[PDB]
Structures are given as structure tokens and as C-alpha cells.
């Protein structure tokens, strides 16, 4: 649970290959691969394939957007099929990360 500087870890919880999960994954991954390339690390958790992991993180809905790192974990719930919401939410989260500096270095 050690906070990371600059690079943040975003986890997407999906269920199989449903249109909602496919849409959400394409939207989040593409935005992170181009819009936030090199800034965020994307992690995808398949709740149906590994329900044990889903239960461990108490995932009762899919897809679910959550920033596991840096802590606290940011859970974002809404229409992720819309690229604007994914982009806007990622942008706001990134600003928070940039604001937090390890040291002034002066």
C-alpha cells in the first residue's frame, strides 16, 4: 500500500466480455495509452475468471473504475462508456498526483 509518485495504478473490474466491459476497457485503455501514456499503469481484474479476487475487493458491480495507487483507493462509478467521463476523471486524478510532491528539492 506504498504510495507511488508520478505513475499511478488504475484498476478496472470487468465481468467476462460483455459490451459494457468491452466498451469500458476500450475507452479506458485507449485514453491511458495515448492521453496519459507513461503516467498511468492500467490493471484489469476479471471478476468472473477470478471471483475470489472479486470477493476479496468486494466487487459487486462491473465494470468498476478504481485507482488503487496511490492510496487512498479512488472508486469511480458511472457511465464509463463515455470517453469524456473516463478522460475527465483521469485528468482530475492526475492533477491530484502532480500536486503531491515527495520533496521541495530546494
Curated annotation (Swiss-Prot):
SUPFAM superfamilies: Thioredoxin-like. Coiled coil: none annotated. Stable from pH 4.0 to 10. Changing residue 43 to A: Loss of circadian rhythm. Stable from 4 to 40 degrees Celsius. Gene3D superfamilies: Glutaredoxin. One of its GO terms (biological process) is circadian rhythm. Keywords: Biological rhythms. Belongs to the KaiB family. Undergoes a major conformational rearrangment; in the free state forms homotetramers with 2 dimers. When bound to the CI domain of KaiC, KaiA or CikA switches to a monomeric thioredoxin-fold (KaiB(fs)). The KaiABC complex composition changes during the circadian cycle to control KaiC phosphorylation. Complexes KaiC(6), KaiA(2-4):KaiC(6), KaiB(6):KaiC(6) and KaiC(6):KaiB(6):KaiA(12) are among the most important forms, many form cooperatively. Binds to KaiA; 1 KaiB(fs) binds to the KaiA homodimer. Binds to the B-loop in the CI domain of KaiC; SasA and KaiB compete to bind to the CI domain. Has 2 forms, fold switches to a thioredoxin-like fold (KaiB(fs)) when bound to KaiC, KaiA or CikA. The KaiB(fs) form binds faster to KaiC than its alternate form, so less fully phosphorylated KaiC forms; the KaiB(fs) form activates signaling through CikA and inhibits signaling through SasA. The C-terminal region may confer species specificity; C-terminal hybrids do not all rescue deletions in S.elongatus PCC 7942. Key component of the KaiABC oscillator complex, which constitutes the main circadian regulator in cyanobacteria. Its composition changes during the circadian cycle to control KaiC phosphorylation. KaiA stimulates KaiC autophosphorylation, while KaiB sequesters KaiA, leading to KaiC autodephosphorylation. KaiA binding to KaiC yields KaiA(2-4):KaiC(6) complexes which stimulate KaiC autophosphorylation. Phospho-Ser-431 KaiC accumulation triggers binding of KaiB to form the KaiB(6):KaiC(6) complex, leading to changes in the output regulators CikA and SasA. A metamorphic protein which reversibly switches between an inactive tetrameric fold and a rare, thioredoxin-like monomeric fold (KaiB(fs)). KaiB(fs) binds phospho-KaiC, KaiA and CikA. KaiA and CikA compete for binding to KaiB(fs), and KaiB(fs) and SasA compete for binding to KaiC, thus the clock oscillator and output signal pathway are tightly coupled. This is Circadian clock oscillator protein KaiB. It comes from Thermosynechococcus vestitus (strain NIES-2133 / IAM M-273 / BP-1).
